Amino acid sequence: GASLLHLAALHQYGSNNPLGVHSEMDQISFYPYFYVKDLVGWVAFAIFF
Amino acid sequence: TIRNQRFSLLKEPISSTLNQHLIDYPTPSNLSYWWGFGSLAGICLVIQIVTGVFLAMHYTPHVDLAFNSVEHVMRDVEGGWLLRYMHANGASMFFIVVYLHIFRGLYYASYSSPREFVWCLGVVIFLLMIVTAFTGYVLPWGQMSFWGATVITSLASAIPVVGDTIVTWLWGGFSVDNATLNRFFSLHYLLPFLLVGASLLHLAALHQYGSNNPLGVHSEMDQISFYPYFYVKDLVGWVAFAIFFSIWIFYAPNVLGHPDNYIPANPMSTPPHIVPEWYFLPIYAILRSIPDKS
Amino acid sequence: SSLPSLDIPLGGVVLPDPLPDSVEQSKTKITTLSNGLKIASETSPNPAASIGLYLDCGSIYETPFSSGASHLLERMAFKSTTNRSHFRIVREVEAIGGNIGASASREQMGYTFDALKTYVPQMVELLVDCVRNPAFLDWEVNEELRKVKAELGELSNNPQGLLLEAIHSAGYSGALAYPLLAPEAALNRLDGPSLEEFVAENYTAPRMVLAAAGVEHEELVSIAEPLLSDLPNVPRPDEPKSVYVGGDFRRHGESGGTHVALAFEVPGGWHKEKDAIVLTVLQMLMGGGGSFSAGGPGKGMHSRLYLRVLNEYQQIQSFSAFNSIFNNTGLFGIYASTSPDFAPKAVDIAAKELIAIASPGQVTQVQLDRAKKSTKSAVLMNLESRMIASEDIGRQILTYGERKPLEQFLKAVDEITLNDITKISQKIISSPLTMASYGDVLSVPSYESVNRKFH
Amino acid sequence: IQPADVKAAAMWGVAAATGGLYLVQVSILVLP
Amino acid sequence: EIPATVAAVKNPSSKIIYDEHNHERFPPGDPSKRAFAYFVLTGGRFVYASLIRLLVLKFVLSMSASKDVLALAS
Amino acid sequence: APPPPTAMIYDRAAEAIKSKLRQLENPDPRFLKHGNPRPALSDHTRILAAPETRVTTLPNGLRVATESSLAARTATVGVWIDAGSRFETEETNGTAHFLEHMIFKGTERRNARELEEEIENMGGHLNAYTSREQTTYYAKVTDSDVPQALDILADILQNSRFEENRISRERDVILREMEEVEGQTEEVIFDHLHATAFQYTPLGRTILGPAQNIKTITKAHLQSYIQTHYTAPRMVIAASGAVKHEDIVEQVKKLFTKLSTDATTTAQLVAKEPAIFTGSEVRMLDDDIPLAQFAVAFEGASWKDPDSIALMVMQAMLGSWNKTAGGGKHMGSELAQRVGINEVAESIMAFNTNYKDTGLFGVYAVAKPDCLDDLSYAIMQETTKLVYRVSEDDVTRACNQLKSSLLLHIDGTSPVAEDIGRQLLTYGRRIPFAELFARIDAVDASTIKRVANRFIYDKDVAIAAMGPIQRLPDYNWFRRRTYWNRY
Amino acid sequence: SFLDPKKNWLAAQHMKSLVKRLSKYGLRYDDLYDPYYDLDVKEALNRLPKEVVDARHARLKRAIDLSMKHEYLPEDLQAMQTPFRGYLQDMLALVKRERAEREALGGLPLYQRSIP
Numbered sequence A: 001g002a003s004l005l006h007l008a009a010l011h012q013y014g015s016n017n018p019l020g021v022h023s024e025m026d027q028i029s030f031y032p033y034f035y036v037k038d039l040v041g042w043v044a045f046a047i048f049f
Numbered sequence B: 001t002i003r004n005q006r007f008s009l010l011k012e013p014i015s016s017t018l019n020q021h022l023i024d025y026p027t028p029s030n031l032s033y034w035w036g037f038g039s040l041a042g043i044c045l046v047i048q049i050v051t052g053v054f055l056a057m058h059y060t061p062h063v064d065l066a067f068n069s070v071e072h073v074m075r076d077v078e079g080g081w082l083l084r085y086m087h088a089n090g091a092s093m094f095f096i097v098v099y100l101h102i103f104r105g106l107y108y109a110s111y112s113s114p115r116e117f118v119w120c121l122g123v124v125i126f127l128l129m130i131v132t133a134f135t136g137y138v139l140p141w142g143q144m145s146f147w148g149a150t151v152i153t154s155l156a157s158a159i160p161v162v163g164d165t166i167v168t169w170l171w172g173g174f175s176v177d178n179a180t181l182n183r184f185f186s187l188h189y190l191l192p193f194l195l196v197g198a199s200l201l202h203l204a205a206l207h208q209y210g211s212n213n214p215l216g217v218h219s220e221m222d223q224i225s226f227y228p229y230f231y232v233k234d235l236v237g238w239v240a241f242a243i244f245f246s247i248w249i250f251y252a253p254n255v256l257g258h259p260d261n262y263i264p265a266n267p268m269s270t271p272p273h274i275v276p277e278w279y280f281l282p283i284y285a286i287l288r289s290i291p292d293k294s
Numbered sequence C: 001s002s003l004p005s006l007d008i009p010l011g012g013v014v015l016p017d018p019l020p021d022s023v024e025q026s027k028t029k030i031t032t033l034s035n036g037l038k039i040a041s042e043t044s045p046n047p048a049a050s051i052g053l054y055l056d057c058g059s060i061y062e063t064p065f066s067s068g069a070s071h072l073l074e075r076m077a078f079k080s081t082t083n084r085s086h087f088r089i090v091r092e093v094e095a096i097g098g099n100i101g102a103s104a105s106r107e108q109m110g111y112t113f114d115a116l117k118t119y120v121p122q123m124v125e126l127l128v129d130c131v132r133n134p135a136f137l138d139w140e141v142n143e144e145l146r147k148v149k150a151e152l153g154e155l156s157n158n159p160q161g162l163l164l165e166a167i168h169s170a171g172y173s174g175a176l177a178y179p180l181l182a183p184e185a186a187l188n189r190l191d192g193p194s195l196e197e198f199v200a201e202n203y204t205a206p207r208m209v210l211a212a213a214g215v216e217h218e219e220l221v222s223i224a225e226p227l228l229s230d231l232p233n234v235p236r237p238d239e240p241k242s243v244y245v246g247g248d249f250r251r252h253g254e255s256g257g258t259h260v261a262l263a264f265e266v267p268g269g270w271h272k273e274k275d276a277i278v279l280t281v282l283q284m285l286m287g288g289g290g291s292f293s294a295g296g297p298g299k300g301m302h303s304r305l306y307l308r309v310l311n312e313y314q315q316i317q318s319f320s321a322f323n324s325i326f327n328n329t330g331l332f333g334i335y336a337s338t339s340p341d342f343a344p345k346a347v348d349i350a351a352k353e354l355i356a357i358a359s360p361g362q363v364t365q366v367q368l369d370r371a372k373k374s375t376k377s378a379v380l381m382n383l384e385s386r387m388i389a390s391e392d393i394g395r396q397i398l399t400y401g402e403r404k405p406l407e408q409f410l411k412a413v414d415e416i417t418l419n420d421i422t423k424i425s426q427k428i429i430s431s432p433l434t435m436a437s438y439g440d441v442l443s444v445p446s447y448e449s450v451n452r453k454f455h
Numbered sequence D: 001i002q003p004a005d006v007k008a009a010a011m012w013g014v015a016a017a018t019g020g021l022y023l024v025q026v027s028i029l030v031l032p
Numbered sequence E: 001e002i003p004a005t006v007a008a009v010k011n012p013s014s015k016i017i018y019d020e021h022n023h024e025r026f027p028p029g030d031p032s033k034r035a036f037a038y039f040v041l042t043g044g045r046f047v048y049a050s051l052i053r054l055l056v057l058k059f060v061l062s063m064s065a066s067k068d069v070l071a072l073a074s
Numbered sequence F: 001a002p003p004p005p006t007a008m009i010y011d012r013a014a015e016a017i018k019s020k021l022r023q024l025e026n027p028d029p030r031f032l033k034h035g036n037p038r039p040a041l042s043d044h045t046r047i048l049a050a051p052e053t054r055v056t057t058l059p060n061g062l063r064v065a066t067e068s069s070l071a072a073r074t075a076t077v078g079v080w081i082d083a084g085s086r087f088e089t090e091e092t093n094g095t096a097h098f099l100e101h102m103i104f105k106g107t108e109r110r111n112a113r114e115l116e117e118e119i120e121n122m123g124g125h126l127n128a129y130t131s132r133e134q135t136t137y138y139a140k141v142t143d144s145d146v147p148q149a150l151d152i153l154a155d156i157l158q159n160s161r162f163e164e165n166r167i168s169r170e171r172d173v174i175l176r177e178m179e180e181v182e183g184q185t186e187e188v189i190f191d192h193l194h195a196t197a198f199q200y201t202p203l204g205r206t207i208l209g210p211a212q213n214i215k216t217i218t219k220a221h222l223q224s225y226i227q228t229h230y231t232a233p234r235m236v237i238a239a240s241g242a243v244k245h246e247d248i249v250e251q252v253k254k255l256f257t258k259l260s261t262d263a264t265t266t267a268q269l270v271a272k273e274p275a276i277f278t279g280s281e282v283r284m285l286d287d288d289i290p291l292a293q294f295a296v297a298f299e300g301a302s303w304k305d306p307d308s309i310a311l312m313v314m315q316a317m318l319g320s321w322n323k324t325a326g327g328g329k330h331m332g333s334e335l336a337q338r339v340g341i342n343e344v345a346e347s348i349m350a351f352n353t354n355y356k357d358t359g360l361f362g363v364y365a366v367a368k369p370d371c372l373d374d375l376s377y378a379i380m381q382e383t384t385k386l387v388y389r390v391s392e393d394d395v396t397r398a399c400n401q402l403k404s405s406l407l408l409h410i411d412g413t414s415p416v417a418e419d420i421g422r423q424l425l426t427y428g429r430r431i432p433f434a435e436l437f438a439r440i441d442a443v444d445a446s447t448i449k450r451v452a453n454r455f456i457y458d459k460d461v462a463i464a465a466m467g468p469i470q471r472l473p474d475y476n477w478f479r480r481r482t483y484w485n486r487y
Numbered sequence G: 001s002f003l004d005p006k007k008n009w010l011a012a013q014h015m016k017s018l019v020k021r022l023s024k025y026g027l028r029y030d031d032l033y034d035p036y037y038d039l040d041v042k043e044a045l046n047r048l049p050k051e052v053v054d055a056r057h058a059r060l061k062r063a064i065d066l067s068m069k070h071e072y073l074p075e076d077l078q079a080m081q082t083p084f085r086g087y088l089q090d091m092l093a094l095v096k097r098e099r100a101e102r103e104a105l106g107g108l109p110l111y112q113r114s115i116p
């Protein structure tokens, strides 16, 4: 439940970025562009685990 | 209206969803008390969860210790008889309230469009309640507990090709022993949270399509906010339910049960009268009436 | 705490002695600041003081670049300055409890402020600051421009002002023809730097009058000289020219009635005091009404137009006869609002009336006497309301360089005669007809057909 | 405004202490 | 004729009639009670406070120690 | 390599805006030596000097009051009768207004046509109006011609002649006037608010009354009403401008003699059938109207209540806001700031109405159908804030605004005469400016809090709403917002 | 104290490093001010001219694109970059001064941050 509230607040204001600047000019949808990135992360974590 | 400076905390983003869906949800102005029964079923679920957690702080899922652990809860724990009677009779009242909920739905044809999803999620909820109450009733490990578990699990053999395999896999070891006891404790602890999720989805779908009314007519002409108008009605319902449930807890706590569950499980002898709890009795009667167990 | 229940005097008060019951009639002191500015004041018995600052600027001085600066300046009157913010200005005005107003006309425009007589330095300082040192900020100007665009979008609700503007534009050529309500193209073109340049070019010392209503002259001058004496002395560039020859304006709108208005020249102007007074008396004789008012006697229900038209002709919504006098020019005429089917007959009736006043013998001595008495009464009852007193001081000093005493107006109205009325009507009808029409105009006669009369 | 604010805060503190005593009746702490 | 809902808009009357099938109206002169209601609500409110304290203490003391342990304290 | 700010139009724009900002950054003291936006009290005793309002009481009970300023050239002479639409008998509601309309017309010698011809020949004006419990017939005239106006007033008020044909014509006119008032939504809202707040009381009924009653006058009700309510003790003659008190007294004594001697005194009449505030609401939903207009109101104070001045101050510190107001987002009152900043209303106006033995106090908002809930929150929040947490600067600003508003409103000859008559009818005396200022200055934060607790804290409200009001909160919402649980 | 790169070697090195970084990504120092951060920057950007604000948005989009692509500005435009040529600090100071005055004497906040 706390994780869901965490995600709800973040989605209220949107995620940060490495530059730390306002970033509502260049944005893309989550799927599929970050789904595949997180997939690479998950598989690397699976190898580690 | 441009929200430059904040007026009300209820309209702030921290309490905005809660505001809408709890305080400001428009409701038909002519609802009777059976919508209160729906809210009451929610409260019964919460009561069951809390008392079950505090009971599981004292229950040992082993076959050699379960019954004596429950008698520990009744005799030694400070105010433990209250916890156990609340859990058992609260299961009973949960089923009573859900039955009244269902029968109001049938009477007013609330299952009709566009609330088909609400009704279907309700059916799923009812299945979850049945399973949870059954596996929980197996936990105290008495004569009725053990033998009801045996019978209801062994009627799963009626599946044509994979019946025996499923029965043995669910039993875990050719009988209803310690392995089944641990399995059932874990499942009984887990299922109520899936039940909470199902209840939340139930309410979300209903809130999508409004709410029926005793007339069954379109009801967007005369609608009032949920708070405080229906909170007070639900409160009257809750207090009356509390009086009913207190009558059951303190004065007649063992009426809704069977005396065979106070004998330690003995897989050798068989009690002469094996029946489930009173709220499974209609289903048991249908199944027993139609012969040829398949 | 205890209180005496408000029907009993409150404990111990230090209430002062009353005025001496006909103290005196205060005179207007005018001091000419050497850069060329005017500071005038007079004493008042009431505890309220009205202080205004009046400028010889407006639509006539507008230029194709500006074309709307006057209206925008009226809207942007008491905004943020180079010394105070807008919030500070509003807080000051509220703190002393006064009222701020701004008026923008074709020839001159003023900023007025009202408060108790105690707060004279505050009044004069805030006024001089807001006029002399404006900071036209882009965001404030944009907000006011948005509001002005909305108001332009809500203009048709009052056809009378629309028809006055239409008559001016049609029956004048350059200067008086410059519009007053800032059309949409001009509104889009307008800007903060444009306002800055316009103000800096026009708001100069030799065309500034600071007039007070209930303020001692010594106090006013002692607080105003350290705030206005250092303005640059400019050579007062000349006033624009405008010729009268003009015809017809016609605009089609909704289907509810038609509003037709006629007007003429009378080129005397405010400097021709006799003709201006005769024109005012003629207006008070003509006047009329809206046939829907239920006030009571004295509102001109026995005027010539009221009697004849309204008591004789029905289905005519409103019928008035008005005038507007500027420095060295005039504009007198008749407004009519009637049903679309009746409109040609309404134009005929208005022409009949305007020619009836012209021909001698058609105006009775009793009607003339009533008109003169009503004009004297209107002027006298208007010179109460100290706001009006200060406005009159400012306008008169801007026009004539002094304040013409009231006795002059009263004597002129006294001496007007039927021969004067007839001669002025004959002169005013000779000038080319100016006509405007608004509404279901697809049935009103042609300008030349109407102009067949009057000549 | 500050005197009223501190008075209200003290009143709420008294209410909170009363609720605390009601929830946890402690004559053991009350007596000394 | 007059649609009978603009008649009520155009004709405000000082004699206003309510339903009075579920609730009897006070005669106009009588004051608003406003006190009986709050005292009834207060009685119920401290009943609720008693109930809540009971439940909370039951749970916490159940999670507290046990009689057999206290016996074995020696 | 780096381009200069001359190129790069955005660089040029940044340079221009920075230049302007650095231009306006340095203030000047010679234009700031007197501002002080923080409000403070002051003693205008050196300024509050006005001629004494001489009052005389002719032994038939008739009060005549003058405030002469013989340096002027106009004057205002009028009669202020302590009677109005409140003192009817539930079947003669429109009698006062209809009698106004009739008494304009004719007497035994005035001949309405030539009466109005005389009025307009002397150049003056003649007007009248009836409130719920006040009636005024005044005339504005010039010097050396006042006596004709006074004689005309006496003649119309004593020897008026009512004829049937003029009564039919005025029936037609008043039916038209009734048919034109529903366009003015503010008056409709306030009429409904009065009816639903002071219901089953003489203050509930409107001024015009019902058309079914206007159709049944027959002039017997008119004559009975005038003979029963225009008695000598209940009238006041007032004069300002260029008048002489002795001349006015002599003329009134010589003229006002065919009066209606009687005993119906308004004090005893109000003793029976008093005014009783009853919290309720009326809401007329249309949804075909662009704007929703509503008003909430608490019970006010009577004319003689010492807390009436406090209520006036309180309605000054909830001051009105308009969509074309000069201040805009910057204003003294918190309610105006809330409304203007968030643009939740077209215009709000706080009203304080005083009657005998009762009154009203409210906020009169007018907004768009979608902002109504936020607007209602703002209104109730600011009112209960007045209950709980008033501030010294706000109180001082409100007092200054009230003093200024009263003294600026009293401007001219007719306003002075109206003030004299109204004050003589309400308090039995004309309150001097110094005493009025002392009474206002006796109001501070503690006074405001005490009065608001007396009138606002947890009290019933009466609501009248019209238009698209689906979003307007119900009665329980306002009723609960009349108090705070935080304190 | 007030330490500027003219009177401090450490400040000179700090400014040099900041200039190098901003030039690499080609965005002015004022572009780092988030409108969602303060809500005073939001007002200051609301008051600035459209050309300036559009240039700010374009520079930020270019920087974000370069960040995604994992590359830096080509050396030509890198030598053409002008960091620390401010366009916002004066307006932000004016907005904060106005807010301070309004708060200091009476006044309600013209804008407020939602919760959260």
Ligand code: HEM
Pocket: A003, A006, A007, A010, A014, A015, A016, A017
């Ligand atoms: C149960 C463990 C947690 C889970 C599942 C979780 C989940 C998430 C998810 C899904 C996001 C959005 C994706 C992302 O930005 O990476 C996120 C963002 C974030 N989380 Fe958590 N989180 C957890 C613990 C924490 C903790 C312990 C903190 C710090 C106290 C934290 C702080 C943040 C912050 C600051 C962000 C915003 C990231 C950004 O800059 O855009 N999280 N988290």
Ligand code: HEM
Pocket: B034, B035, B036, B037, B038, B039, B041, B042, B045, B098, B101, B102, B105, B110, B111, B115, B118, B119, B120, B121, B122, B123, B125, B126, B199, B202, B203, B206, B211, B212, B213
């Ligand atoms: C965990 C048990 C359950 C809970 C907590 C629950 C909760 C609720 C709630 C909160 C509502 C909205 C309020 C109301 O209308 O009463 C509701 C409505 C409804 N529920 Fe359930 N419910 C449960 C079980 C069921 C079951 C088993 C069914 C039937 C299969 C069902 C069918 C419905 C229907 C049809 C409605 C619509 C109400 C209407 O038409 O007005 N519910 N439920």
Ligand code: HEM
Pocket: B045, B048, B049, B050, B051, B052, B053, B055, B056, B059, B070, B084, B087, B088, B090, B091, B092, B094, B129, B132, B133, B134, B136, B137, B138, B139, B140, B188, B189, B190, B192, B193
């Ligand atoms: C996560 C929440 C829950 C937990 C942790 C839990 C835990 C337990 C435990 C430990 C027992 C055995 C203690 C005893 O013998 O009295 C028990 C019994 C029982 N539970 Fe639950 N339970 C939960 C929720 C529920 C729910 C939602 C139901 C459905 C109504 C339910 C129905 C039962 C039944 C019927 C019994 C047997 C009653 C008896 O002892 O005779 N439980 N539960």
Ligand SMILES: [Zn+2]
Pocket: C294, F097, F101, F174, F177
């Ligand atoms: Zn009338």
